[PDB]
Amino acid sequence: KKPGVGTYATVDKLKAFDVTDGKKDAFTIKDTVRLYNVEEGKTYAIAGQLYEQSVAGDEGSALAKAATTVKVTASMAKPATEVEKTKYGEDVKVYETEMDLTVKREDLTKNQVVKDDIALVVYEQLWAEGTYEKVNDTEVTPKGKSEPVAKHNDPQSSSQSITAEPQFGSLKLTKTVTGWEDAFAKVARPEASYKFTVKCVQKGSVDEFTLKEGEEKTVEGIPLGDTCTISEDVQGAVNQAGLKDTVKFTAVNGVTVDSQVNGEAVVKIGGTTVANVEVTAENSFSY
């Protein structure tokens, strides 16, 4: 029997949190530390670090760090999990304590649009009594070449994983028509089909579709703060109506829509601000 260490990471009792929550400036990862086959009455040092998964273990890349000393006692004992017993034996003695790892929301988002879930992971080390020169509240200083007696530096650990989950916005587009003239039209008004392409730059999306007059289409899952472009096939509209088409874009809820070329709009979907945006493209036909 040799000492071991394990961890279970949570945020507000859960395995994920909303990283695009503007009301939060930081998040606290509860790092529940499980000490295996340690000696009652000895004083160990423990350290934890929080990393984004792709750089997990890279010194300099830590989002948060914590360190402390723990004098192991019987009152800390907790029942072993089946996973713990499988690894360490059915008689493994488990002692539990905890530390907090607090990360600033801006160190996750970089104050930029968040496209995808950010995978996080907690690493932990256990240091035996006398093996560390000192401990501050972030790091254990070794005695020269000394090392922890156990580590849990496991980047694929589900137990130590946390997901920083972004929320998403959406864009609804509705087509309207004014100025139709049967003398010039080449199709029946209710059969006219108006072609659009909606692109969202941070999402990396291209959605092509048609709307008849009065129809709508929604593009979902747009990163908050994304820039979205809407492009109509204006010549296709002109060909069907037999008239010039001035496309007039509007949006509800005070959202601005910019149009620098006829049939082209740019709109922001949320902030880095309204998240479910609704735009109307009016095909204003005239001779």
Author numbering: 1 to 272, 278 to 292
Copy the relevant paper text.
An adhesin from Mobiluncus mulieris, a bacterium associated with persistence in bacterial vaginosis, contains 51 repeat Ig-like domains. Each domain displays cross-linking including intramolecular ester, isopeptide, disulfide and thioester bonds. This giant 7651-residue protein, by far the largest in the bacterial proteome, is presumably retained because of its critical pathogenic role. The intramolecular cross-links, whether isopeptide or ester bonds, stabilize the individual Ig-like domains and provide a covalently linked ‘spine’ the entire length of the protein stretching from the surface of the bacterium to the adhesion domain.
Crystal structures of the mixed ester–isopeptide construct 46E–47I were solved in two different space groups. The molecules of the two space groups differ across 287 aligned Cα coordinates by a root-mean-square difference (r.m.s.d.) of 1.78 Å. Each pair of domains aligns more closely (Cα of residues 1–168, 0.72 Å r.m.s.d.; Cα of residues 169–292, 0.50 Å r.m.s.d.), suggesting that the flexible interdomain linker affords slightly different relative domain orientations. An unambiguous intramolecular ester-bond cross-link is seen to connect Thr6674 on the first β-strand of the domain fold to Gln6827 on the last β-strand. A short 2–3-amino-acid linker precedes the isopeptide-containing 47I domain. As predicted, an isopeptide bond links the first and last β-strands of this domain, joining Lys6842 to Asn6955. At the N-terminal end of the isopeptide domain 47I, the disulfide bond between Cys6895 and Cys6887 links two adjacent strands within the same β-sheet. The disulfide linkage between Cys6887 and Cys6895 identified by mass spectrometry in the 47I domain is not fully formed in the crystal structures, possibly as a result of radiation damage, and is consequently modelled at partial occupancy.
